[PDB]
Every structure is written in structure tokens, then in C-alpha cells.
Design a protein that fits this description.
homodimer; 6-stranded mixed β-sheet; 6-stranded antiparallel β-sheet; 8 helices; 32% strand; binds sodium ion; GCV_T_N (chains A, B); GcvT/YgfZ/DmdA (chains A, B); methyltransferase activity (chains A, B); Dimethylsulfoniopropionate demethylase DmdA (chains A, B)
Chain lengths: 369, 369
Amino acid sequence: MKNFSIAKSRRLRSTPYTSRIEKQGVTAYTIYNHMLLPAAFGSIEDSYKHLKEHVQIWDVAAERQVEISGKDSAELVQLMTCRDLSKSKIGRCYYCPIIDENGNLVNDPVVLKLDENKWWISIADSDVIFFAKGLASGHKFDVKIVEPVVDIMAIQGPKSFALMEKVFGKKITELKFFGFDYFDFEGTKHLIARSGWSKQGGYEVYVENTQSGQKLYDHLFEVGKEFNVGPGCPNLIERIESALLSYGNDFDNNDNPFECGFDQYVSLDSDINFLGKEKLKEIKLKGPQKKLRGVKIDIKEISLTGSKNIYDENNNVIGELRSACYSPHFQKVIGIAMIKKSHWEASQGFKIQINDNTINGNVCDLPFI
Amino acid sequence: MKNFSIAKSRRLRSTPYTSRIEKQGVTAYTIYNHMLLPAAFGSIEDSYKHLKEHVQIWDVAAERQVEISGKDSAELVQLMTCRDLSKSKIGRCYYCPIIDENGNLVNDPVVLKLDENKWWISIADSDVIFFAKGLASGHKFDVKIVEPVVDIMAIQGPKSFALMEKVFGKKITELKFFGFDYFDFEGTKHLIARSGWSKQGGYEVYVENTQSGQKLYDHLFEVGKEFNVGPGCPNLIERIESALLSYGNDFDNNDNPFECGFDQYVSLDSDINFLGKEKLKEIKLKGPQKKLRGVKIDIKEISLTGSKNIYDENNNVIGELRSACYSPHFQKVIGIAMIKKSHWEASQGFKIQINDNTINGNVCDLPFI
Ligand code: NA
Ligand code: NA
């Protein structure tokens, strides 16, 4: 077969939005945190153009929460991340790389500080819940760790702001990037952050009252018509062009923050203690020997289902291409590659096998645009 | 809206068998431990008839390993599970439920004791690696925790015994259920366990030397024609008929081993140290307020994608149906349901809404065959 069906089960969890997106034209799924996440609503290029010009509503329920509350919650949260959260404030979001005893990445979540003793970790694709529960028991912390009933719906694109003002009023227009607050929809208060996995702008509604959230979803489609609202999902071309890097895809647990361009979130000269702090000091001293870079390959098509070695002018492996797509902006293929320090340099050339043909490519900086 | 395509990417990992099984008729996939696991090779009823009569070779690489080695490995392994490993032997497998701070199920793996100081945890669908790494950090255990390069290939069905004899000779026929040993294929030694996710008989080859395991895979298809060998995967009908439970489907992290029939595997009155031991002492005295049970329901067809409430005569919720299929053996739908204390009783009637018809069903004991 060219395509394989996804086999549904209780274990591969549906969302509060599933029956709706399946009537609105979802054509492919990925799995993220043991949950269905839409991967396409037809053409990925057309979804990208629509996202950059209009507004979309996304089922991103699979961006699960780990809720950590109780006396040692602030501390357990800070143990897990190399980002300094000592001056953190209620109502703010912070991108906090989670790292292990080796200094290697576990997850790149957004942390929401709801209160001094209550923390939501909005996670990428790995079971941070169990890392937390492991660390809590091992370090003897007094916390409560749950996956709460929270199912995110995103509102993304340049028309997101006008659409959400229409629904929630002028108060939501005051929300700064990566702030959150509580907003009323027909009696129910919903936590809404100004965040989301694009650079086109918008919001994420952290739906706890599921029924009210489903009615809100339906309402956004009804009063969004004048804005050309439509369904969507995180967009492959957008995430590569803007270097919105994802755990499991661009980097994984054999990679450290310094190989992924996360230098500014690794806070080594505080007195806060987090995992692998010592090992990350050594890495920052000797410097990394490999790093995520962009690449361009002058072909009009690619379908990356997995990794692919890239080779030098002698046919020695100089890196690994990890994500890639056709970019209409460049009218060629662009990607994210973990490349050896020998070939880091913006403009450095390389060779890669696409089918049975060597083809040339070149390294570039991230983001692409 | 009926079947949906899966979107492949690096993050949904492929396996050493992917290119082979996509030439042998795989039609559907699930995702298991962030990895492709075949869900169908065409009709589920026909794969089922074939498994029960003949022999199949399965890609089950998604049954990943957590390898824990070093001086504190035995202790860390035991800390994660309720099952008593104090008398454990090299060359044996053990079903070892992993339990958290609430006494609830994290994963239900098989543990393989390779050495006093080297352990493989063969995992269900959750990231046990990070629970282990969390525990190890707190207790400052002297251990190394990695996911090794191990990609299980299974041989299952009544003809598995004879096919493996053909390849490996008499010594494989000596291997007892849940034992493992090392067996020579073309000069390479492979760890092979007598185990796997059917009740139809067979083996799991824990392939570390991938190129040799790929050659072995192709060899099995050649010298297995005598036994009508074919491709396959864990079979939904077979596994419900045999009451083989799965983490995420029948039970999850809100469930404790006393609710799932894991009583024989919980060691409360030994001296072993493990998480939630006290909670499980509490829980076992009070007793389970709900348990897993069999159900049989009078329709010839179902598509379970999620929990489905089952009701008494007067529309009260007595349970939740979690796995279900049409059983060609019963010529009707059977399933596994988590049922309230009030309605446990073997033969209790109930009703379930499936589209435009209310359907009679009743509770029964496990297994079915
Ligand atoms: Na989702
Ligand atoms: Na697999």
C-alpha cells in the first residue's frame, strides 16, 4: 500500500475534538503522547498558505499537561529544567528544556506558573509524567502529580486576534505573548494562553470544562466565517522554515541543549540545581562537536519518513538530515540536520542520496526566514 | 471519514523490519513506544485464523528494552515493581507490574535477568526509561540506564515450536516457557525467549545484531513454507479471547493491580522494597471498588475507539467497556470492561447503546477460551 491506515484503540486516545475534525476533513493523523493529533487537512502547502493569511482552529489535545502541585512543586519543576525559574511569575509561560542525568533532552515543554504551589508542564512527545513521579519519589518530594483533564484547542494565524476579540472582548487583546489569564465563555472561565506551535500568532485554550470547550470550538467556527476560519494543525513547512524544533523529530534523548541551539535557556551561573548541571558546564567549556543546522537541497520534492546521512566531498558521513520538506518560498527542499563541526559553516556543501541519485545540498543558518 | 492515513516522520520510529513488512502486505499501523507497530496485514479475522493454525513472524521492535546495569541495578529494578525478584534466576523472564506512588500501574513489562548486574525490562506502551532515570537520580544509584539497540522479532502460533527446531535444532525445544538462552544463527548468537503477545505458543528473538536478525527474518520465511509461515502482528481477536490485557487499553495509570487481576504478582508480605507498597497494603484490605471482567454483547460487529459506558436496566453507569471485537468463535462481540463492585457477578445483564439499537449483554469470567 502507499498509505497505511492508523489503527484506533482506547490506547491511541481520541480527543474531545475528534468527531468534529473528522467531519471537517482531517486526512492524516500522527500520534503524540499516546493520543491522536491531526497531521493534514489535505494539501500541506495550501494549509500553510491559509495559516499565514487567515485563522485556524486546531485540535492539539495531545499536548498533554503534567500537573505538579503541593509544597515541593516549584522545586521539582526547577530540578527537571536547565532554565532558571527563580524569578518566575503567576500568569506567565516559560519554554523550559527538560534534561536527564547526562544533560540530554527528555522533552521541550512550556511551563505555566498558575500559583507558587501549582504548575502545568505543557509537554512535547514523551512521558514527562513518569520522569516527575520517578524524581519525586527518589528525591522524597511532597507533591501531587497528575495528568489533569485538559485538552488544548489552538487559534492560530494573523486573524486569530480579531477572532478572539470578537469572542472574548478587548480584555484578551491585552494578553502579552506567553501570558495567560482566565476568560469567560457563556458562564465558564477558561484558561487561555497566548502561545501555540506557529509563528503566525494566536492562542491556546486550555480546556478543562470539556463540554464548554466543545461549544466554544463550534462557536469559533460559526462567528469565524467572515475571517475565513478553517480547521488545521501544526504545519510541517512552517515548523521547518521557522525552526520550531520538536522533541523526537529534530532532537532526542542522545542530544543536549547545546547541540539544539538552546544555549539561552541553560542557566549555568545561577545557584539553582537542576539535573546534569555539572555535565552541561563541561559541554559548554569543550563546546559541542555537532549542532542542528538548516540545509537546502535543489530538488522540488522529498518525503522524509526518517533519518538520512549527508556526506562530504570524499563520501564520509558529515551529518544526519532529520526533517525536510518542499518550501514554496525557496522553491526547493529545506531541512533540519544534525551536522558535524567539520561542516557547520553556512554555505558548506554536501551530498545526499535521494532514491539512487546523489544530489547536492548546502548548509545554512536557522531559522530560514 | 472512516479510515485515516498515518503520517510518517522520524519521531514515529521505523524498525529493522519496516522495508520487509511493507513488501509483505501490512495495511495498518499503531504507534507503541514512539515506534511503528503493525496493526493489520489485511483482514483481522483471517490473520487470526492463520495465527491459530500455523506460524507467523512478527515485527515487535516497538516492545522496547530499558537496560539497567551496574552495582545498584538489581535494587532499582526491584524498586519499580511489586513482583518479588529476590529469588530471580539468570535465564528467566518475569512479569513485573511497575507501580507508582499511588499503587497504580505505570507499565506491565517482562523483566529478563541477564546478570545479577544487568537487566532488560521489555516494556508496554509507556516511557519506563524516564521513571527509572527519575528514581536513579534521587537515590543516586550507581547504574547505567539506556534503551539498547534491541528490536524484537516474534515467532508465534502452534507451528512456532517446529519452525524454530528446524532452524536451531533440538536445544531450542528444551527452552521452557518464560525462559531465555543464546542460540547460534550463521555464527551470530541471539538471545531468544519463549514468550510473546499471543497464547498460541512461540518465541521472541531479542535482536541486537540487526543485520543478522534481518537475515534470520528472511530465512524463517524461506524454511517456514512447510508450516505455511506468514507475516503478522498482535491480533486483537486472539488477544481478547485469551484475556491478554494491554496497558493503555484495559488498564491505565488510574488503575491498581488488585483491579486488573494481578493479585498473584503483588508481593506484600516479603521484605522487598518497592513504591506504593504501603498504598497497596491499604488497598488490598479495603478491597477493589471495581475490577476487570469479561462481557459478551449480542451484535455481530463493533469499532471500539475509546471507553464506552455500560448501563443497568435504568440508565445508571455500572461499568466501562475498554476493549472489544467480534469473536468468530462466539459468532458475537466480546470485550473487557472495568465493572463496579455492584455488578461484578458472573452473568449480570446490562445494556449498551450502539447507534440506533439498545443491546443486551452480560458480565462473564476471564478468559473466554
Ligand atoms: Na491532539
Ligand atoms: Na514494532
